[PDB]
Amino acid sequence: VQLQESGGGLVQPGGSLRLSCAASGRTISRYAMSWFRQAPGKEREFVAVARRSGDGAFYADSVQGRFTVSRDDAKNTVYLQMNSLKPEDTAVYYCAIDSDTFYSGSYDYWGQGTQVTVSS
Amino acid sequence: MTQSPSSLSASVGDRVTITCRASQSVSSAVAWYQQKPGKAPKLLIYSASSLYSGVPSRFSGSRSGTDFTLTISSLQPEDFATYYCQQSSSSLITFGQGTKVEIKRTVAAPSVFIFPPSDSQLKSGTASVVCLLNNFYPREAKVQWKVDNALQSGNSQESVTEQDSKDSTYSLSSTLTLSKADYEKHKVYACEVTHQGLSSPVTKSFNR
Amino acid sequence: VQLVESGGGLVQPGGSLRLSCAASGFNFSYYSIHWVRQAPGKGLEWVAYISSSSSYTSYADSVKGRFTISADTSKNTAYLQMNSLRAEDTAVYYCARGYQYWQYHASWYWNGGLDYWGQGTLVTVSSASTKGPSVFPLAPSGTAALGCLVKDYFPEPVTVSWNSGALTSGVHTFPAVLQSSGLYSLSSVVTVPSSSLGTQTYICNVNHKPSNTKVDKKVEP
Amino acid sequence: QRQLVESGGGLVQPGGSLRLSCAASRSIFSIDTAGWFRQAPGKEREGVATITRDGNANYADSVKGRFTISRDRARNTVYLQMNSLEPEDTAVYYCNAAIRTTVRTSAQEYWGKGTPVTVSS
Structure with missing residues (x-):
């Protein structure tokens, strides 16, 4: 199983990016897919989770309202639409598969991450 | 009867749908009931499409295919309870396993605490070890007991609170019960917790 | 229209007990009576059904045979008669009004439902005696x-x-x-x-x- | 109270129409006075219409304009045609009767079993 994040980059405050996470070796349709982020030296922190279609998306306090997670099951890809970006959002963003279909966060597979830098 | 969604989360005023898979019964039309915690279930919809006299108009029926569904158009802050579908049959009806709406709220990871058995209890011949997962959301969590790093099975029980009316969280207790003699054979007592809000398991432990 | 349950205390396993469902108001010879059970922390489960006379009575496989329903239009009353109580039957039993000819009706486009519900009694089976913590x-x-x-x-x-x-x-x-x-x-x-x-x-x-x-x-x- | 058999109920969109027909079980001489009752799921058995020996067609006070009782003296069968139905007329529609078996035996009541009628999209 492999995950690959893309879509990061340098973006101005208030601006928008859309991160993508492409999975191979695993059908994502049965699994929740989550986004985490890690600023240097800090702990890797939860951002968002897209559960299976119909089971809802959930978000961290810091990104609620500005970020939206969404899924393309057919293409084994999950997305993080990031609007109204803040300096505080600068981090490496990571995608992870929840291997537990009952949603207990058994994150066995992780991507390598994609850098997001929000500054002018 | 198998209601498809089982823990449908939602926020106030929005629209939600709930479906009851016809388990290829006689397929006589469903009749949705509602029940709040610890009270008498009320009627909501009979013959799958009509309302019960004196029931707010937010509700609705639908007879999509052979998958009967209910749709709350706008969610009043009052409607938060378990819902039941009831299909007739040849000569015995049967209620569905039932789903339960709940209040949307941004994920909260548990705070974890461990408690050793008291000397008073031990002197009586039993050791209860308690692990507390406090104020978390959503409800799903796992507690694993390890005793000298050995995973335990069959000697613990869990209780979970009802959702808190103010902060919409749960708390959970796991109690490991050992004989005094078994308790005194081991040193390290650990409860290891996972939850979707935790990036890595949280372990709380003590040395006997 | 005030259904009222009564008759729930504490029973030893295998024992027997009656349950009374006092009706009122409605002309009792028009409506059925259903007994819907609920285990602790589970979903409801239908258990019995008695019409005006005794010529109508279905049952549910869980208590097929172990349970005897009975009616008495004298006082509009209905009685459940449970025997050979098992350790699991601990529950909170209800009452529920509902159409009389509820079988001849039910079809792919109609389902009467259970209008008026009681308030529930708490049967409890155990071997267990009263004990402080x-x-x-x-x-x-x-x-x-x-x-x-x-x-x-x-x-x-x-x-x-x-x-x-x-x-x-x-x-x-x-x-x-x-x-x-x-x-x-x-x-x-x-x-x-x-x-x-x-x-x-x-x-x-x-x-x-x-x-x-x-x-x-x-x-x- | 059996040996009467209504028939005809069935799903119908708002504003449709349909004809229920109380009947008899076998070779009945005459139907003195009919009557069609309604028992919607949260109310009491109301009553909707009343023919008499010869003809009176007395109705309720909420239905005049849509419900046309009748009789069929040939094959003893009371009728009831409801027209331009509404979502408030959902109920099971019982039938009453005053059957008299043979030309000299006194009258005797009879109730039906009724049929359902649902109105919705």
Whole structure:
């Protein structure tokens, strides 16, 4: 199983990016897919989770309202639409598969991450 | 009867749908009931499409295919309870396993605490070890007991609170019960917790 | 239209017991009576059905044979007669009005439903006798948690307060769970400021009325 | 009270129409006085219409304009045609009767079993 994040980059405050996470070796349709982020030296922190279609998306306090997670099951890809970006959002963003279909966060597979830098 | 969604989360005023898979019964039309915690279930919809006299108009029926569904158009802050579908049959009806709406709220990871058995209890011949997962959301969590790093099975029980009316969280207790003699054979007592809000398991432990 | 259940105490396994469903108001010879059961913390489950006469009676496989329904239009009353009670039948039984000819009707486009529900009695099967809890501290080791373990009592309920009701914020008294002994156990916990542990006293006040048990337990760091 | 058999109920969109027909079980001489009752799921058995020996067609006070009782003296069968239905007329529609078996035996009541009628999209 492999995950690959893309879509990061340098973006101005208030601006928008859309991160993508492409999975191979695993059908994502049965699994929740989550986004985490890690600023240097800090702990890797939860951002968002897209559960299976119909089971809802959930978000961290810091990104609620500005970020939206969404899924393309057919293409084994999950997305993080990031609007109204803040300096505080600068981090490496990571995608992870929840291997537990009952949603207990058994994150066995992780991507390598994609850098997001929000500054002018 | 198998209601498809089982823990449908939602926020106030929005629209939600709930479906009851016809388990290829006689397929006589469903009749949705509602029940709040610890009270008498009320009627909501009979013959799958009509309302019960004196029931707010937010509700609705639908007879999509052979998958009967209910749709709350706008969610009043009052409607938060378990819902039941009831299909007739040849000569015995049967209620569905039932789903339960709940209040949307941004994920909260548990705070974890461990408690050793008291000397008073031990002197009586039993050791209860308690692990507390406090104020978390959503409800799903796992507690694993390890005793000298050995995973335990069959000697613990869990209780979970009802959702808190103010902060919409749960708390959970796991109690490991050992004989005094078994308790005194081991040193390290650990409860290891996972939850979707935790990036890595949280372990709380003590040395006997 | 006031259905009323009655007749629920405590039974030894395999025993027998009657349950009374007093009706009122509606012309009783027009409506059926259903007994809908609910285990603790599960979904409802249909159990029996009696019409005006005794010429109509279905049943549910769970109590097929073990249960005898009966009617008496003299006092609009309906009676359930349970025998060979099993350890699991512990439940909260109901009543429910509903159409008389509810079979000849039911079809792919109509389902009468259960209009008026009672309030429920609590049958409970056990071998278990009345017993007050043992109360043990859950000692604390910027928020601390502490508590009391309230163990091996029967029947429900118990109450737990903290500092004689002066401490209410952050208290969680867990739902009781039945142990393999057939006795209940629960913990009551509270989170408090860690900086308070040295100078604030924490006492859980446990009351189990069925046994007249009252225990104050000081919970020390 | 059996040996009467209504028939004809069935799903119908708002504003449709349909004809229920109380009947008899076998070779009945005459139907003195009919009557069609309604027992919607949260109310009491109301009553909707009443023919008499010869003809009176007395109705309720909420239905005049849509419900046309009748009789069929040939094959003893009371009729009831409801027209331009509404979502408030959902109920099971019982039938009453005053059957008299043979030309000299006194009258005798009879109730039906009724049929359902649902109105919705």
